[PDB]
Amino acid sequence: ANDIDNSNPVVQAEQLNWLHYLMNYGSIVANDPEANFDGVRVDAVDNVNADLLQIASDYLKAHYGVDKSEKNAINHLSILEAWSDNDPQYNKDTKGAQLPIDNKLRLSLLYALTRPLEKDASNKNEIRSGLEPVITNSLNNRSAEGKNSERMANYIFIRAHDSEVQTVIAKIIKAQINPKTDGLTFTLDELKQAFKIYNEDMRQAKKKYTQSNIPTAYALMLSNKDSITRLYYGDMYSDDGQYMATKSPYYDAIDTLLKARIKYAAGGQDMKITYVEGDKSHMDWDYTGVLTSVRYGTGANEATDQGSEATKTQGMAVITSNNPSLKLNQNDKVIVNMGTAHKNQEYRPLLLTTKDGLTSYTSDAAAKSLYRKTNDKGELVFDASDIQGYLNPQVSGYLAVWVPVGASDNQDVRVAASNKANATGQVYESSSALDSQLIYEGFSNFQDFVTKDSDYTNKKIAQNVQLFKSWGVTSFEMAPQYVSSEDGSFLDSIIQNGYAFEDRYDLAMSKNNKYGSQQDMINAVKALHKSGIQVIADWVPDQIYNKDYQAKYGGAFLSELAAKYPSIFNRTQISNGKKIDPSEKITAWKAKYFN
- The phi and psi torsions of 284 (rounded to 5 degrees) equal -90, -85
Q: What angle do CA 34, 38, 40 make, to 5 degrees?
A: 140
Which residue in 255, 225, 219, 258 sits closest to 237, CA to CA? 255
- Whole-angstrom Cα distance, residue 378 to residue 336? 8
- Closest Cα partner for 16 from 586, 592, 590? 586
In the chain, CATH 2.60.40.1180 sits at: 269-412
Delimiting residues of CATH 3.20.20.470 domain(s) in the chain? 1-164+211-265+414-595
Q: Which residues contact 360 (CB under 8 A, 6 or more apart)?
A: 252, 253, 256, 350, 351
CA–CA separation, 499 vs 545, rounded Å? 9
Look at the domain 1-164+211-265+414-595 and name its fold. Answer: TIM Barrel (3.20.20)
Give domain 269-412's CATH number out of 3.30.70.100, 2.60.40.1180, 3.50.50.60, 3.40.50.920.
Answer: 2.60.40.1180
Tell me, rounded to whole angstroms, the distance of Cα 583 from its chain centroid.
Answer: 39
Contact 398, 319 (CB under 8 A): yes
Write the CB contacts of 198 (distance below 8 Å, at least 6 apart in sequence): 168, 169, 172, 209, 210, 239, 240
Q: Is the dihedral of CA 468, 217, 447, 360 positive or negative?
A: negative
- Percent of residues in the chain assigned helix, strand, coil, to nearest 5: 35, 15, 50
Closest CA to 383 of 396, 369, 393, 372: 372
Q: What letter would DSSP give residue 331?
A: T
Please state, in angstroms and rounded to a whole number, the distance separating the CA atoms of residues 436 and 414: 5
Give the integer Cα–Cα distance in Å for 333 and 275: 10
For the beta carbon of residue 443, count every other beta carbon within 10 angstroms. Answer: 23
CB-count burial class (<10 Å; 0-12, 13-18, 19+) for 414: middle
Element (H, E) at 390: strand 390-391
Give me the DSSP letters along 261-312: HHHH--S-EEEEEEE-----TT-SS---EEEEEEE--TT-SSTT----GGGT
Helix pair 51-64, 9-23: axis angle to 10 deg: 40
**What CA–CA distances, in Å, run from 38 to 64, 66, 118, 511, 528?**
9, 11, 46, 25, 11
To which H or E segment does residue 465 belong?
helix 465-470
CA dist., res. 403 & res. 412, Å (int): 14
Main-chain phi, psi angles of 166, to 5 degrees: -50, -45
